[PDB]
């Protein structure tokens, strides 16, 4: 399955490289988002993994409750989103799509690949599990990346908020 190489390439070529400085980049931004308004950005990188492999070309968040707030400054392109409930801010995080799913989607439309929609879903799930396994075995790169994988029959904003609130619960325990 292609998912093994996709997961390793994404980790080795992207996640391994941004994650070390991410906590410092967010902590530095929180030295301003605190005094300006009163929120705080979560410290983990949240990666959206829609198992139907639907990734918007412009990489934006369609959900009106996932609202672009700011670009995160350098220490490349990482966006901070506000998660809304009833039009009010309920959380703030760095959020982006797992771009290797775009490759899986394109393979499923490339008939010479012999790669069906059923094959695509299996590889998307295997990509999630492989990347989760890599991240769990990783050093500092590990502890600050969370995969949000989902299948649709659903509120994406509520699913991200579930993860953010669980991150806070774990924070206040030791
Ligand atoms: Ca505590």
């Amino acid at each position: 399955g292609v998912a093994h190489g996709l997961a390793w390439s994404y980790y080795i070529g992207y996640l391994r490289l941004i994650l070390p400085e991410l906590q410092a980049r967010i902590r530095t931004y929180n030295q301003h988002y605190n005094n300006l308004l009163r929120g705080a950005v979560s410290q983990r990188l949240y990666i959206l993994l829609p198992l139907d492999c639907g990734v918007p070309d412009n990489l934006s968040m369609a959900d009106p409750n996932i609202r672009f707030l700011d670009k995160l400054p350098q220490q490349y392109s990482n966006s901070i989103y506000e998660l809304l409930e009833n039009g009010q801010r309920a959380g703030t995080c760095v959020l982006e799509y797992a771009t290797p799913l775009q490759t899986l989607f394109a393979m499923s439309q490339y008939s010479q690949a012999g790669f069906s929609r059923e094959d695509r879903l299996e590889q998307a799930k295997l990509f999630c599990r492989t990347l989760e396994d890599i991240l769990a075995d990783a050093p500092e790169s590990q502890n600050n990346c969370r995969l949000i994988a989902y299948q649709e029959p659903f509120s994406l904003s509520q699913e991200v908020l579930r993860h953010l609130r669980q991150e806070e619960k774990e924070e206040v325990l030791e």
Side-chain angles (χ1 to χ4, degrees), residues 76-88 90-106:
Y76 275 149
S77 181
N78 299 110
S79 299
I80 302 164
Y81 293 83
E82 282 178 327
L83 287 302
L84 306 186
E85 286 183 331
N86 316 301
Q88 297 293 271
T92 314
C93 70
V94 183
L95 188 65
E96 57 194 56
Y97 287 97
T99 50
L101 303 181
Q102 293 181 121
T103 303
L104 293 181
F105 187 80

Short mmCIF file of all heavy atoms in Angstrom, two decimals, residues 76-106, unseen atoms left out:
data_model
loop_
_atom_site.label_atom_id
_atom_site.label_comp_id
_atom_site.label_asym_id
_atom_site.label_seq_id
_atom_site.Cartn_x
_atom_site.Cartn_y
_atom_site.Cartn_z
N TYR A 76 6.47 26.36 7.24
CA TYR A 76 6.53 27.79 6.94
C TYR A 76 5.19 28.49 7.18
O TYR A 76 5.09 29.36 8.04
CB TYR A 76 7.00 28.02 5.50
CG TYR A 76 8.51 28.02 5.36
CD1 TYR A 76 9.12 27.58 4.18
CD2 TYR A 76 9.33 28.45 6.40
CE1 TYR A 76 10.51 27.58 4.05
CE2 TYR A 76 10.71 28.45 6.28
CZ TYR A 76 11.30 28.01 5.11
OH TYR A 76 12.67 28.01 4.99
N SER A 77 4.16 28.11 6.41
CA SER A 77 2.85 28.76 6.47
C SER A 77 1.93 27.96 7.40
O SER A 77 1.53 26.84 7.07
CB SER A 77 2.24 28.88 5.07
OG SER A 77 0.99 29.53 5.13
N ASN A 78 1.60 28.54 8.55
CA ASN A 78 0.72 27.91 9.53
C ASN A 78 -0.33 28.92 9.96
O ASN A 78 0.01 30.05 10.33
CB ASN A 78 1.49 27.43 10.76
CG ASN A 78 2.54 26.41 10.43
OD1 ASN A 78 3.73 26.69 10.50
ND2 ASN A 78 2.10 25.20 10.10
N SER A 79 -1.60 28.52 9.92
CA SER A 79 -2.71 29.42 10.21
C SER A 79 -3.33 29.09 11.55
O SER A 79 -3.49 27.91 11.90
CB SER A 79 -3.77 29.35 9.11
OG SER A 79 -3.21 29.73 7.86
N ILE A 80 -3.69 30.13 12.29
CA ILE A 80 -4.39 30.02 13.57
C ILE A 80 -5.88 30.24 13.31
O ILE A 80 -6.26 31.22 12.66
CB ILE A 80 -3.86 31.06 14.57
CG1 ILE A 80 -2.37 30.85 14.79
CG2 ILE A 80 -4.61 30.98 15.89
CD1 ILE A 80 -1.72 32.03 15.44
N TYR A 81 -6.71 29.33 13.81
CA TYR A 81 -8.16 29.40 13.64
C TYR A 81 -8.85 29.55 14.99
O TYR A 81 -8.40 28.98 15.98
CB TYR A 81 -8.69 28.15 12.96
CG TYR A 81 -8.20 28.07 11.55
CD1 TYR A 81 -6.94 27.56 11.29
CD2 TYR A 81 -8.96 28.57 10.50
CE1 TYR A 81 -6.46 27.50 10.02
CE2 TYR A 81 -8.47 28.52 9.18
CZ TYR A 81 -7.23 27.98 8.97
OH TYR A 81 -6.70 27.90 7.73
N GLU A 82 -9.94 30.32 15.01
CA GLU A 82 -10.85 30.31 16.14
C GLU A 82 -11.98 29.32 15.88
O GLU A 82 -12.57 29.32 14.80
CB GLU A 82 -11.43 31.71 16.38
CG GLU A 82 -10.45 32.62 17.10
CD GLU A 82 -10.99 34.02 17.31
OE1 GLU A 82 -11.77 34.49 16.44
OE2 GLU A 82 -10.65 34.64 18.34
N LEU A 83 -12.25 28.46 16.86
CA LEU A 83 -13.39 27.56 16.80
C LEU A 83 -14.58 28.21 17.50
O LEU A 83 -14.46 28.60 18.66
CB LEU A 83 -13.06 26.23 17.48
CG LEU A 83 -12.12 25.24 16.81
CD1 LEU A 83 -12.67 24.86 15.40
CD2 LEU A 83 -10.71 25.78 16.72
N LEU A 84 -15.71 28.30 16.81
CA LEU A 84 -16.86 29.05 17.30
C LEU A 84 -17.95 28.11 17.77
O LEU A 84 -18.14 27.02 17.21
CB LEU A 84 -17.44 29.97 16.22
CG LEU A 84 -16.48 30.96 15.56
CD1 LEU A 84 -17.26 31.89 14.63
CD2 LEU A 84 -15.70 31.73 16.62
N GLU A 85 -18.64 28.53 18.83
CA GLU A 85 -19.89 27.93 19.28
C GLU A 85 -20.87 29.07 19.47
O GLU A 85 -20.58 30.02 20.19
CB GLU A 85 -19.71 27.15 20.59
CG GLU A 85 -19.00 25.82 20.47
CD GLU A 85 -18.92 25.07 21.82
OE1 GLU A 85 -18.90 25.73 22.88
OE2 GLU A 85 -18.92 23.83 21.82
N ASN A 86 -22.01 29.01 18.77
CA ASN A 86 -22.99 30.10 18.79
C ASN A 86 -22.33 31.45 18.51
O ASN A 86 -22.62 32.45 19.16
CB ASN A 86 -23.73 30.13 20.12
CG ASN A 86 -24.15 28.75 20.56
OD1 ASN A 86 -24.87 28.05 19.84
ND2 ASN A 86 -23.65 28.32 21.73
N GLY A 87 -21.44 31.48 17.52
CA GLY A 87 -20.81 32.73 17.16
C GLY A 87 -19.81 33.28 18.15
O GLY A 87 -19.30 34.39 17.94
N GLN A 88 -19.49 32.55 19.22
CA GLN A 88 -18.51 32.98 20.21
C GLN A 88 -17.28 32.07 20.16
O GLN A 88 -17.38 30.88 19.85
CB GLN A 88 -19.08 32.98 21.63
CG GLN A 88 -20.24 33.95 21.83
CD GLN A 88 -19.82 35.41 21.73
OE1 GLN A 88 -19.42 36.02 22.73
NE2 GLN A 88 -19.91 35.98 20.53
N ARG A 89 -16.13 32.65 20.50
CA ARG A 89 -14.87 31.90 20.48
C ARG A 89 -14.88 30.86 21.58
O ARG A 89 -15.08 31.18 22.76
CB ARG A 89 -13.68 32.84 20.64
CG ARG A 89 -12.33 32.12 20.46
CD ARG A 89 -11.16 32.98 20.87
NE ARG A 89 -11.19 33.31 22.29
N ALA A 90 -14.70 29.60 21.20
CA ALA A 90 -14.62 28.53 22.17
C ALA A 90 -13.26 27.88 22.23
O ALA A 90 -13.03 27.04 23.11
CB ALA A 90 -15.68 27.45 21.87
N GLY A 91 -12.35 28.22 21.32
CA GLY A 91 -11.01 27.69 21.33
C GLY A 91 -10.25 28.30 20.18
O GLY A 91 -10.83 28.93 19.28
N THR A 92 -8.93 28.10 20.20
CA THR A 92 -8.02 28.64 19.19
C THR A 92 -6.87 27.66 18.99
O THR A 92 -6.24 27.24 19.96
CB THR A 92 -7.48 30.01 19.63
OG1 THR A 92 -8.55 30.82 20.12
CG2 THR A 92 -6.84 30.73 18.46
N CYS A 93 -6.59 27.30 17.73
CA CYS A 93 -5.51 26.35 17.49
C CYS A 93 -4.91 26.53 16.10
O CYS A 93 -5.49 27.19 15.23
CB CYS A 93 -5.99 24.90 17.66
SG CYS A 93 -7.12 24.32 16.40
N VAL A 94 -3.73 25.95 15.92
CA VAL A 94 -3.08 25.84 14.63
C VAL A 94 -3.63 24.58 13.98
O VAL A 94 -3.59 23.49 14.56
CB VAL A 94 -1.55 25.77 14.77
CG1 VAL A 94 -0.90 25.74 13.37
CG2 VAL A 94 -1.01 26.94 15.59
N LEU A 95 -4.16 24.73 12.78
CA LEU A 95 -4.96 23.69 12.19
C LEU A 95 -4.58 23.61 10.71
O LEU A 95 -4.40 24.65 10.07
CB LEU A 95 -6.45 24.03 12.42
CG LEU A 95 -7.53 23.03 12.07
CD1 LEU A 95 -7.45 21.79 12.93
CD2 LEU A 95 -8.91 23.70 12.18
N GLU A 96 -4.38 22.40 10.20
CA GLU A 96 -4.18 22.25 8.75
C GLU A 96 -4.52 20.84 8.29
O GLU A 96 -4.62 19.91 9.09
CB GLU A 96 -2.75 22.58 8.36
CG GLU A 96 -1.73 21.75 9.10
CD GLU A 96 -0.35 22.33 8.96
OE1 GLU A 96 -0.18 23.52 9.30
OE2 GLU A 96 0.56 21.62 8.48
N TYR A 97 -4.68 20.69 6.97
CA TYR A 97 -5.01 19.38 6.42
C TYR A 97 -3.75 18.54 6.22
O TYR A 97 -2.67 19.05 5.96
CB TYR A 97 -5.72 19.53 5.05
CG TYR A 97 -7.14 20.01 5.14
CD1 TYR A 97 -7.45 21.36 4.96
CD2 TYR A 97 -8.16 19.13 5.39
CE1 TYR A 97 -8.76 21.78 5.01
CE2 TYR A 97 -9.47 19.55 5.46
CZ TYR A 97 -9.76 20.88 5.26
OH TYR A 97 -11.06 21.30 5.32
N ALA A 98 -3.93 17.23 6.28
CA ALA A 98 -2.87 16.30 5.91
C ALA A 98 -2.81 16.25 4.39
O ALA A 98 -3.56 15.52 3.74
CB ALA A 98 -3.14 14.92 6.50
N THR A 99 -1.91 17.04 3.81
CA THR A 99 -1.85 17.13 2.35
C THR A 99 -1.57 15.81 1.62
O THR A 99 -2.00 15.71 0.45
CB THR A 99 -0.83 18.22 1.97
OG1 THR A 99 0.40 18.02 2.67
CG2 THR A 99 -1.39 19.62 2.33
N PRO A 100 -0.93 14.78 2.21
CA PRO A 100 -0.80 13.51 1.47
C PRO A 100 -2.13 12.89 1.05
O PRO A 100 -2.14 12.06 0.14
CB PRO A 100 -0.05 12.60 2.46
CG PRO A 100 0.76 13.54 3.27
CD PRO A 100 -0.19 14.70 3.50
N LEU A 101 -3.24 13.23 1.71
CA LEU A 101 -4.54 12.70 1.26
C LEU A 101 -4.89 13.18 -0.14
O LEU A 101 -5.69 12.53 -0.84
CB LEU A 101 -5.65 13.09 2.23
CG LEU A 101 -5.38 12.63 3.68
CD1 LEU A 101 -6.56 13.04 4.56
CD2 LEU A 101 -5.18 11.11 3.75
N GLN A 102 -4.38 14.35 -0.53
CA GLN A 102 -4.60 14.83 -1.89
C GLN A 102 -4.02 13.86 -2.90
O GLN A 102 -4.59 13.66 -3.97
CB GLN A 102 -3.98 16.22 -2.05
CG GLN A 102 -4.65 17.32 -1.25
CD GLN A 102 -4.00 18.69 -1.45
OE1 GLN A 102 -4.66 19.64 -1.89
NE2 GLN A 102 -2.71 18.80 -1.13
N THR A 103 -2.87 13.25 -2.59
CA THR A 103 -2.27 12.27 -3.49
C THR A 103 -3.17 11.06 -3.64
O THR A 103 -3.33 10.52 -4.75
CB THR A 103 -0.90 11.83 -2.95
OG1 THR A 103 -0.09 12.99 -2.81
CG2 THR A 103 -0.22 10.80 -3.84
N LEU A 104 -3.76 10.61 -2.53
CA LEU A 104 -4.68 9.47 -2.56
C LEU A 104 -5.90 9.80 -3.38
O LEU A 104 -6.36 8.97 -4.19
CB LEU A 104 -5.10 9.08 -1.14
CG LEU A 104 -4.03 8.50 -0.20
CD1 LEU A 104 -4.64 8.15 1.16
CD2 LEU A 104 -3.40 7.27 -0.85
N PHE A 105 -6.45 11.01 -3.20
CA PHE A 105 -7.60 11.38 -4.03
C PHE A 105 -7.22 11.40 -5.51
O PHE A 105 -7.96 10.88 -6.35
CB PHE A 105 -8.15 12.75 -3.61
CG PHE A 105 -9.44 13.09 -4.34
CD1 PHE A 105 -10.64 12.56 -3.92
CD2 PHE A 105 -9.42 13.89 -5.47
CE1 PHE A 105 -11.83 12.84 -4.62
CE2 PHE A 105 -10.61 14.19 -6.16
CZ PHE A 105 -11.80 13.67 -5.72
N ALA A 106 -6.08 12.00 -5.85
CA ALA A 106 -5.69 12.07 -7.26
C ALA A 106 -5.45 10.68 -7.86
O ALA A 106 -5.84 10.42 -9.00
CB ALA A 106 -4.45 12.94 -7.44
#
